[PDB]
Amino acid sequence: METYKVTKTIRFKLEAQNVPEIQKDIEGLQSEFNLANFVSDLKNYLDQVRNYLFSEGKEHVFVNNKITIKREWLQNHAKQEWVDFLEKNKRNNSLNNHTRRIQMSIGDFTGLASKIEGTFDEINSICKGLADAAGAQANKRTKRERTGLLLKRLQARKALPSLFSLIENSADKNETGNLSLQLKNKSILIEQQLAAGVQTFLPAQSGGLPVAKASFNYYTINKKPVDFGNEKSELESRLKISIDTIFKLTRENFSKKIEEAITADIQKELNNGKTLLLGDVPMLGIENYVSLRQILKNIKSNQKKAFSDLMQSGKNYNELKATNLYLLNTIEQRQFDNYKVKTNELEKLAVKINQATNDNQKKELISNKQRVAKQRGIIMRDNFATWKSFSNFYRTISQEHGKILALLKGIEKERTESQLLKYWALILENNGQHKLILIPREKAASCKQWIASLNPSGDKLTKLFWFESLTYRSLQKLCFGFTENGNNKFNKNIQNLLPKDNSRKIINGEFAFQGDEQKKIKFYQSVLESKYAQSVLNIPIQQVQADIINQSFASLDDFQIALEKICYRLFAVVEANIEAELLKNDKAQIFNITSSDLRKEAKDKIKSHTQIWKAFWTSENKQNNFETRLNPEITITYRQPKQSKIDRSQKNNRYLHAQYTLITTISEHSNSPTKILSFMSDDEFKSSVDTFNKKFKKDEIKFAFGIDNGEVELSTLGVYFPAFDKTTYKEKVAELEKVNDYGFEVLTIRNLNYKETDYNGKERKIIQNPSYFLKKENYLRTFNKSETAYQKMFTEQFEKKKLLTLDLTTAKVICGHIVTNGDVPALFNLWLKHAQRNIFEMNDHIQKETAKKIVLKNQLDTDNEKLKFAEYISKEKEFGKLNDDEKMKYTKWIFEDRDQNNFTEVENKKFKRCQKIYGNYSTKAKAPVLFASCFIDEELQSVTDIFDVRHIFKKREDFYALKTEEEIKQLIDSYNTNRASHDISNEELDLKILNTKKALVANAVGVIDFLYKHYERRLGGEGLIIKEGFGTGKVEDGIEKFSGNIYRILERKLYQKFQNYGLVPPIKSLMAVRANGIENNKNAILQLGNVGFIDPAGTSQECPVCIEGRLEHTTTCPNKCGFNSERIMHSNDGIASFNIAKRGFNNFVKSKTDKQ
């Protein structure tokens, strides 16, 4: 198996040596903000938008179908939808001319409306949250944090930005006023104020904030500035219009009366200093200027509506002549008669449709109605000469506006772009460490000229570095970059090379090639061959001449790949006093690259990240065409000190001072790129993924791991072997008993409460951090004891085991060892903060003073609450089918001991489909339960349950050595009764939760990785990883909305990890998976590389041997099959993983029945 090409983000700490310049920007980034004003403006804006999108009709409030959308928006937010649309059109061959005047609208896209409505509702909810926050009376810091978080959430690339995009890229055919312009204008102010707010309230994000950008490639930086404002004004001047000249721009010879009517209508706005302009300029925030386009639109719409209303009323011809609809009152009485006849036909068809009794007949009537409507529209569009002329005129006008607009948009874009790339980048090496050097934009020419004159590389401890790289996209941006403005010097030079029209006109844009790969290939070949080009670009001419130029390719992909592959070079020079000279002459900025590790000579180990960076500079990596590559662009961020506590010194740490931070991108195994999968048509997806899987073979799978499914704390892991598949129960059980063979080593802490004292007189607890104990060196250094004492302590404290299964909850890796009980504090913290979160949520509701009364009863103790708990744990859809007696039986089943009632097989089967997950609630794990129904001391009747029931917490079996039993009850109870004294916001608690979850997954990842490696090495083959239930595809609603959903997190993380080894298909995000085929098929399997999924069939507690038996409370199977769990598995709860693995493997085998 061979690795892919992979890209990882990387960070570093920066220390300032001399930063006089760069600092200026930071100074200039200061802004002002006002909370209340922002909230009010956002509320008003959101109020207005609804009138834009949503159409009338209380029966169904929904987004107008007929709304039009540009391709642009879709490509940034609706990838999948777009793709689907394309395929739909393409496949169907609804394109009998291979290029067309295409148009599209919302109603033309499947499911888009639901998406847009959801986004709008989410934004409204966030706005309400901000309003409440503003009106809040919390403590100062609390408030500040809350606000910050809210802003953060609001500002994400799933939010307001999206809406703005939508707005900016949409239009209405039937607008009557001028709302769209107002929304367009207000968008910019909202954006700027959001920016300001972010700036203000969030100066202490872990990543800091962007301040400047730099790149290594000389291509981009050398861009000289352009006086955009003057060109802006020049362009703007073209919109000036004289009222008399409006009709002189078209060939339509409108009647004098009609033209006078239009003039009067336009003159209606000739007042109050209003200035008439051809179009509209949002970019300049124009207001109090009237756009002719909009006026014509309005006139069109209004007269159309009036005419339709008149026909719907069946008024006479003479009455039409008396109307003011000058655009339509000029038609013939014959045309009016034909139109009225068609309208009467439509009325009859509608009456019949209302009289329709069958779907097919109604469909036929609707088709006839559509045909008649098309006939009416054809007649209207053909016969109405005045309408025609109006339309023509309108069209004439329209185009011009856009013309100018596009140019303006481009200019703006360009300006925005150029405002970023301030500095050219260089790296200096000295005494085994690296300094970062930035050169100002304006000195780049002299800097480049000077460097080229220096001597070549020399064997000395001082050196300088500078890159040069070429990529397909880079080249394309060079070639066709903003050619419209004529600012692209490069594009000028190459002009003679381009293809020509029939007219001999040079077509200065990519569309000239009409999608022919064979043409694009040849063109870039030529380009490269171009003498001019070679002057600006430094490239391996010798190699490329044969490898690129003088070659042919099957598809664009190969060319792309090749180009990307070869074009990468690195240079160095040496000279005395370079550091001084650069700062002296070119205003050079200097940074010191530093790390916690980089400083230390203890090369014992280093963080993962660090290894990459060090490996890059090694001599060997140079020979292999830089198997590790560094991207050409970088970012700089700044972070303010968070200091908000009273004085007494505390200690030195990060966050106590301002810090500069570096951002880069690095790649691995670049020599072997591959087409990265993304959102695609299902067919392509399936074909690709299946092709990848065939790389394996049936007989290469030596082993498999099962990951179980359960509640919030995660659950057990175990292995399976082919050999286990014996013929008889006796042989099976005998085989299984060979644990000594097939097993793996683990460690257990004998005593959680062990402790010792250091030379400092400070206590150390084993359960706080095993590391300080296990590791010989650490122990020695900390406690100065002898090696013999070390050995004695180790053998006394620690116990060894060999097992097939593991409790993954507490599992942790330490110094090449597996520890079952290694990490308690993490798990304790998770359960405690989950409990507080839910108690907070419950007390948040029932804000009205009647019977608030949470009771924390630790027991159900009453009916009508059991039912509600059952309701809470079960699926609605399945739950609805049960009768009250069935419900009761359900409850009993849930709560009652397994042997109390002889549940029928049908009852069991139906039950099993109800619950989300299984677990004991009476006798094993003693989880405390909440309800709030208690007005008065409880009674079987009354005491309405609608105040809800909730699953709070769990007692771990050791309690903990942490804290004390009495105090945990107190802590949890306190959290209900004493809300006020706890100074934490809901909106932040979620965040704090998330991380904890996030962190804890790490341990799991590590353990699985370790075991995988181990087994692989031992056996010399690849293994299968099986997980119960495909989760990522779900809704994730409610509490979960911002809580993580632990299994989802694991799902993604695990996948990510494996990606390195190249054992899974190159999927960029898991969301793309077409997981529909899994549901309800015990024999089914979904395969992704070596990773797979199976349905949750509820096989738990199923005997591994005899299948029939049930394992509840005894290590020995009650079915007398000879099976015993004592010697094999840590606990009976390991059993679920084993079954999972078995089943999965079996399925895997079966799938290749008709393929291998």
Partner RNA sequence: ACCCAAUAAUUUCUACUGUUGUAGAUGAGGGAUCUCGCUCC
Segment 1004-1043, which members bind RNA (CB under 7 A)?
1005-1006, 1009
Tell me the pairing of strands 1091-1094 and 1086-1088.
antiparallel
Name the one range near RNA by CB under 7 A: 98-106, 254-262, 891-899, 1140-1148: 98-106
Residue pair 551/518 in contact (Cβ under 8 Å)? The answer is no
Binders of RNA among 663-702, rule CB under 7 A? 665, 678-679
Cα dist from 816 to 607, 777, 813, 973, whole Å: 16, 15, 7, 41
Candidates 146, 186, 342, 401: give the one binding RNA (CB under 7 A). 401
Q: Does 647 bind RNA (CB under 7 A)?
A: no
| Contact call for residue 342 and RNA (CB under 7 A) | no
938-943: long-range contacts at Cβ-Cβ below 8 A with a sequence spacing of 24 or more?
Answer: 938/861, 938/862, 940/862, 940/863, 940/864, 943/862, 943/864
The whole-angstrom separation of Cα 81 and Cα 78 is 5
User: Of 424-432, 598-606, 620-628, 1087-1095, which part binds RNA (CB under 7 A)?
Assistant: 598-606
Rg (CA), the chain: 36
Q: How far is the CB of 98 from RNA (least distance, A)?
A: 4
Cβ burial of 823 (10 Å; 0-12, 13-18, 19+) is buried
40 binds RNA (CB under 7 A): no
Q: Which helix (H) or strand (E) segment is 429 a member of? A: strand 421-430
Least Cβ distance, residue 945 to RNA (angstroms): 34
By beta-carbon proximity to RNA, the closer residue of 836 and 874 is 836
Q: What are the DSSP E strand ranges found in 154-295?
A: 170-171, 209-215, 275-277, 289-291
Q: How is 969-1037 classified by DSSP, letter by letter? A: HHHHHHHHH-GGG----HHHHHHHHHHHHHHHHHHHHHHHHHHHHHHHHHHTSEEEEEEES--TTS---
- Of 405, 498, 506, 677, the one binding RNA (CB under 7 A) is 405
Min dist CB 1064 to RNA, Å, is: 14
**Min. distance of Cβ 906 from RNA in angstroms?**
41
Residue closer to RNA, measured from CB, 157 or 257: 157
Kindly list the distances between the CA atom of residue 242 and the CA atoms of 12, 107, 272, 298, 625, in Å, as whole numbers in the listed order.
Answer: 60, 40, 17, 20, 65
Q: Does 144 sit near RNA (CB under 7 A)? A: no
CB of 683 to RNA, least distance (A): 19
Q: Of 605, 648, 848, 877, which one interacts with RNA (CB under 7 A)?
A: 605
Answer yes or no whether residue 101 interacts with RNA by CB under 7 A. Answer: yes
Q: Which of 137, 206, 245, 449 binds RNA (CB under 7 A)?
A: 206
- Please give the C-alpha separations between residue 503 and each of 83, 484, 495, 499, in angstroms, as whole numbers: 36, 20, 16, 12
Of the candidates 897, 875, 879, the one whose C-alpha atom is nearest the C-alpha of residue 1034 is: 875
**Closest to 50 measured CA to CA, from 33, 68, 62:** 62
Residue 645 or 877: which CB sits closer to RNA? 645
Question: Which structure tokens are listed for 883?
Answer: 């009768």
List the interface residues with RNA, window 58-77 (CB under 7 A). 66, 70-72, 75-76
Using CB under 7 A, which residues numbered 511 to 550 contact RNA? 511, 513-515
Contact window for RNA (CB under 7 A) among 503-511, 840-848, 916-924, 944-952? 503-511
Of the listed pieces 99-107, 282-290, 730-738, 1138-1146, which binds RNA according to CB under 7 A?
Answer: 99-107
Q: Which stretch binds RNA (CB under 7 A): 416-424, 709-717, 921-929, 999-1007?
A: 999-1007
* Interface with RNA, residue 90, by CB under 7 A: no
Among 900, 1071, 1077, 1083, interactor with RNA by CB under 7 A: 1071
Kind and range of the H or E run holding 906: helix 905-912
Q: Of 76 and 250, which has the nearer Cβ to RNA? A: 76
Nearer to RNA, 107 or 928 (CB): 107
- What mask of x and - would describe binding to RNA in positions 455 to 474, judged by CB under 7 A? ------------------x-
Binding letters toward RNA, positions 151-170, x by CB under 7 A: ------x-------------
Q: How many helices, marked H, and strands, marked E, lie in the chain?
A: 41, 28
CA distance linking residue 746 with residue 819, whole number of Å: 6
Angle, helices 444-452 vs 578-586, to 10°: value is 150
Q: How far apart are CA 533 and CA 530, in angstroms?
A: 6
Q: Which one of the spans 604-612, 905-913, 945-953, 1147-1155 is the region binding RNA (CB under 7 A)?
A: 604-612
Give me the amino acid identity at 575. E
| Residue 663: CB minimum distance to RNA, A | 8
Q: Smaller CB distance to RNA: residue 657 or 792?
A: 657
Q: Which one of 105, 199, 1124, 1132 is in contact with RNA (CB under 7 A)?
A: 105
Q: Does 621 bind RNA (CB under 7 A)?
A: no
Q: Is the dihedral of CA 216, 220, 224, 229 positive or negative?
A: negative
* Angle made by CA atoms 738, 740, 745, in degrees to the nearest 5: 140
Contacting RNA within 821-880 (CB under 7 A):
825-826, 829
Judged by CB under 7 A, does residue 983 bind RNA?
yes
- Kindly identify the residues of this chain, within the stretch 377-396, that bind RNA according to CB under 7 A: 377-378, 380-381, 387, 391, 394-395
Q: Which stretch binds RNA (CB under 7 A): 569-577, 589-597, 897-905, 1118-1126?
A: 589-597
Tokens coding 382:
């053909």
In whole angstroms, the minimum distance from the beta carbon of 787 to RNA comes to 17
Least Å distance, CB 658 to RNA, is 11
- Phi/psi of residue 742, each to 5°? -85, -15
Q: Which of 449, 652, 788, 902 binds RNA (CB under 7 A)?
A: 652
Q: How many residues bind RNA (CB under 7 A)?
A: 117
Report the distance separating Cα 664 and Cα 684, nearest Å.
33
Closer to RNA by Cβ: residue 458 or 509: 509
Query: Which one-letter amino acid corresponds to residue 899?
Result: D
CA dist., res. 874 & res. 917, Å (int): 9
CB 742 within 8 A of CB 724: no
Residue 977, interface with RNA (CB under 7 A)?
no
- Nearer to RNA by Cβ, of 646 and 946: the residue is 646
Measure the CA–CA gap between 887 and 950, rounded to whole angstroms.
19
Q: Name the one range near RNA by CB under 7 A: 225-233, 539-547, 646-654, 1103-1111.
A: 646-654
Phi, psi of 453 (to 5 degrees): -85, -10
Instruction: Indicate the residue among 464 and 968 with the shorter CB distance to RNA.
Output: 968
Range 271-330, binding RNA (CB under 7 A): 300, 304
Nearer to RNA, 764 or 1074 (CB): 764
Subset of residues 1074 to 1133 that bind RNA, contact rule: CB under 7 A = none
Residues 356-375 that bind RNA (CB under 7 A): 370, 373-374
Let me know: does 572 contact 464? Beta carbons within 8 Å.
yes
Q: Which is nearer to RNA, 583 or 598 (CB)?
A: 598
By CB under 7 A, name the one of 781, 979, 1041, 1150 that touches RNA. Answer: 781
Question: Residue 799 interacts with RNA (CB under 7 A)?
Answer: no
Q: How deeply is 13 buried, as exposed, middle or buried, from its count of CB atoms within 10 A (0-12, 13-18, 19+)?
A: middle
Q: In residues, how long is the chain?
A: 1156
Least Å from the CB of residue 293 to RNA: 7
Interface region with RNA, contact rule CB under 7 A, candidates 683-691, 787-795, 1003-1011, 1084-1092? 1003-1011
Per CB under 7 A, contacts with RNA among 1040-1059 are 1056-1057
